[PDB]
Ligand binder design. Structure first.
Ligand SMILES: CCCCCCCCCCCCCCCCC[C@@H](O)O[C@H](CO[C@H](O)CCCCCCCCCCCCCCC)COP(=O)(O)OCC[N+](C)(C)C
Lengths: 91, 486, 48, 95, 48
């Protein structure tokens, strides 16, 4: 009997598909527990206002305010203690 | 009502709170330092209770190192055995104390039980009282000596401790190696009757099994001495170990005994009530069997690991079906396809088995338990245990690997039933076998932890089946938290 | 002391195996007698 | 994203004590399990049941030539449709 | 990370015992423990 000349090295197919499965599954969580220091803010509200403020000065195109506000936001990032200092919700 | 209000509402100041080791060092450091440590230890405790020449020296030391290491290994194994000895001792020592009271009865023939008890509020594990000279010199001496006698004693108490395991071993082996009609039918029924009630699983049943054994052996005797061939009893070795099974069972009765255990309308309504007290009362016995509160320790993890091992056993049994019982290259598997439906059915069944076992673990409902036992028994009996299984050329020649799988499932099922006896899944704590945390334990668990696909299956099942406020993110992060923590 | 009690078990078992080691009617009689004593063995020793 | 969560909780705060709702776990778990199990056995089921299928090819022509030396085919015969008799099961049994 | 173990199995414990607020309470505590490294190290300093 003859069959059309699919079904070659199927174990390959198996191994690569399952390792692709591994890639996605580890992708969902690989080090996401590391990405646990950014989701605790009670209100990122002031961060919003300042970031749109840097955008504002962007169109109004003032010189030092730009890098000034970028450095402030960067410092806000540096300290978690600072991410939480005033972000504690209004009493 | 703040479901996520607490996630960001947390305060901080309030938040803050108010043996083999010689083998290790010898593999690391010069073992000469290790023996110097061992004898200087000997020195310290004994105080407590009160370079060609160098080449031959290292070689002689090496010979001594080998002797010392062997001695250390036996001591460590002995320590493990000793751990078993303490649990058995609980029984041994309480029995010794009561025996001494009996000794008093022999010396003083009188009758007061409570008075002799008084020399020894009515229920205590510890009973500190007067102490009799012979007992103390006896254990002190026994403790003082040991080179291999420790092993002998350990054998004595372990065998006493096991009590019923060997009967299981013999029953499974005899039928698996030789399976006549009775030899194969009897085990399933004996397991089911046995795995029912903790105080006394079989009121009189053990005797029924043993009596069957004497009559069948007698039958064999006359058999050596036609229609007889029709019966599923065949010429073979005169006997292998049935006498040993019978002696072991007799010892079982002796131990139970030594410990102490047992072993107008008027007439029409009376007859109906009697019938109710036989069969409906038996149904009530099943109900009390299924009633709440029997207490035994719970170890889910041993079941889960045993199950995965069972899958390992099954998967190992794949190439043997082919013309290659040696786990050869995959190409043969590609080019053989020697009736592969059985592999898929078995694997599907075992995965379903794992799913249901976890489901029972989380919800602890009886129907799952019964489903487990019934499905396993029917599967084993229908799938195997007659001429059709010998469809593969596995009559008895290599017909042990499937049997190997058979007993492993059998032990698992029995321990599963024991777990049913304990129940109590709600109360949990880490597996003490895992909680021994040994580097070997650590390696085994991590290897379990490196296999593909584990994370999603465990996370998804627990997530659906855990019944509190929980997001997929929080819980899955928690498994990650467990990974770093361990 | 182990010889005393443990040998009692030993003698009962060994006589049983001696009865069963060779094929004979005499042996079957010994094995059946062994079971008979065996069931009451604890009682027989207990009794006078 | 974090503001979105805050906004939702402000206007959609789950009542305390619900703990969870069963149906949504049914849904999410079912979809996850079906997707993963299906992918796990997709090659397995495909090779088990579906897996190239043998198609019988039967010679539609047979030609036989008897030739001596290099002179000329002394004989040459070709049979194609009616002289190619497929085996009947009875003939197979006889063979 | 010992105390973290005990508290995480404690959240599991309250999980089977299925009490209402303790769950989210202990999840929030563990989350706060993560937030501050200063806090990861406050009492985790080994017993003296
Ligand atoms: C054959 C093909 C099959 C499909 C194959 C593809 C499968 C794709 C799977 C896509 C999954 C999408 C999941 C969407 C989940 C929405 C959950 C939402 O409804 O709940 C909210 C929670 O979800 C959050 O809003 C989403 C948070 C995401 C945080 C992590 C971001 C991850 C990094 C960026 C995404 C990267 C994705 C990479 C992979 C694509 C709040 O819940 P709550 O109000 O209490 O309950 C109210 C009742 N509900 C749930 C019915 C509405």
């Amino acid at each position: 009997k003859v069959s059309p000349p699919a079904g070659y090295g199927i174990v390959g197919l198996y191994v690569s598909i399952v390792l692709v499965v591994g890639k996605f599954v580890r992708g969902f969580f690989s080090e996401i527990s590391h990405s646990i220091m950014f989701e605790e803010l009670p209100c990122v509200d002031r961060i919003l206002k300042l970031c749109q403020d840097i955008f504002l000065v962007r169109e109004t195109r003032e010189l030092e305010l730009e890098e000034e506000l970028y450095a402030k936001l960067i410092f806000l990032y540096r300290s978690p203690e600072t991410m939480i200092k005033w972000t504690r919700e209004r009493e | 009502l703040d479901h996520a209000t607490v996630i960001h509402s947390g305060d901080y100041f309030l938040f803050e709170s108010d043996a083999f080791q010689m083998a290790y060092q010898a593999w690391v450091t010069n073992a000469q330092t290790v023996l110097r440590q061992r004898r200087e230890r000997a020195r310290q405790e004994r105080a407590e209770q009160l370079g060609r020449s160098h080449m031959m020296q290292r070689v002689l030391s090496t010979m001594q190192f080998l002797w010392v290491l062997g001695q250390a290994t036996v001591d460590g194994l002995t320590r493990w055995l000793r751990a078993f000895t303490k649990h058995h001792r609980t029984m041994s020592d309480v029995l010794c104390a009561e025996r001494y009271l009996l000794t008093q009865e022999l010396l003083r023939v009188g009758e007061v039980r409570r008075g002799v008890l008084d020399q020894l509020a009515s229920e205590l594990l510890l009973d500190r009282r007067l102490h009799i000279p012979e007992l103390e010199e006896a254990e002190r001496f026994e403790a003082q000596q040991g080179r291999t006698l420790r092993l002998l004693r350990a054998g004595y108490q372990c065998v006493a401790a096991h009590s019923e395991l060997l009967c299981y071993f013999i029953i499974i082996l005899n039928h698996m190696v030789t399976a006549s009609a009775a030899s194969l039918v009897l085990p399933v029924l004996v397991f089911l009757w046995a795995m029912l009630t903790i105080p006394r699983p079989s009121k009189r049943f053990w005797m029924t099994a043993i009596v069957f054994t004497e009559v069948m052996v007698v039958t064999k005797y006359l058999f050596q001495f036609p229609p007889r061939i029709l019966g599923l009893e065949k010429t073979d070795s005169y006997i292998k170990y049935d006498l040993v099974q019978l002696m072991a069972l007799f010892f079982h009765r002796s131990q139970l005994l030594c410990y102490g255990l047992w072993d107008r309308r008027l007439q029409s309504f009376c007859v109906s009530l009697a019938q109710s007290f036989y069969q409906p009362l038996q149904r009530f016995f099943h109900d009390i069997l299924h009633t709440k509160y029997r207490a035994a320790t719970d170890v889910y993890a041993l079941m889960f690991l045993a199950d995965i091992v069972d899958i390992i056993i099954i998967i190992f049994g794949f190439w043997a079906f082919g013309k290659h019982s040696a786990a050869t290259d995959i190409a043969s598997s590609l080019s053989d396809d020697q009736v592969p439906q059985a592999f898929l059915f078995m694997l599907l069944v075992q995965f379903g088995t794992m799913v249901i076992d976890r489901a029972l673990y989380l919800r602890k409902t009886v129907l799952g338990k019964l489903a487990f036992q019934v499905v396993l028994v029917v599967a084993i009996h229908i799938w195997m245990f007659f001429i059709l299984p010998a469809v593969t050329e596995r009559m008895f020649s290599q017909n042990a690997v499937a049997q190997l799988w058979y007993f492993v499932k059998c032990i698992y099922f029995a321990l599963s039933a024991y777990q049913i006896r304990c129940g109590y899944p709600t109360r949990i704590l880490g597996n003490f076998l895992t909680k021994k945390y040994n580097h070997l334990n650590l390696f085994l668990f991590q290897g379990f932890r490196l296999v593909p696909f584990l994370v999603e299956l465990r996370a998804v099942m627990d997530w659906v089946w855990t019944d509190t406020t929980l997001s997929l993110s929080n819980w899955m992060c928690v498994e990650d938290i467990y990974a770093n923590i361990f | 002391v182990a010889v005393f009690r443990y040998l009692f078990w030993l003698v009962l078992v060994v006589v049983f195996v001696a009865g069963a080691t060779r094929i004979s009617i005499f042996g079957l009689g010994y094995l059946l007698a062994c079971f008979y004593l065996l069931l009451f063995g604890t009682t027989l020793l207990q009794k006078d | 994203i974090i503001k979105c969560s805050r906004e939702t909780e402000k206007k959609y705060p789950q009542p305390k004590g619900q703990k969870k709702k069963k149906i949504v776990k049914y849904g999410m778990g079912g979809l996850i399990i079906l997707f993963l199990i299906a992918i796990i056995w997709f090659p397995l089921l495909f090779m088990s049941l579906i897996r190239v299928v043998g198609v019988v090819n039967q010679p539609i022509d047979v030609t036989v030539t008897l030739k001596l030396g290099g002179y000329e085919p002394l004989f040459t015969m070709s049979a194609q449709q009616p002289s190619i008799v497929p085996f009947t099961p009875q003939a197979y049994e006889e063979l």
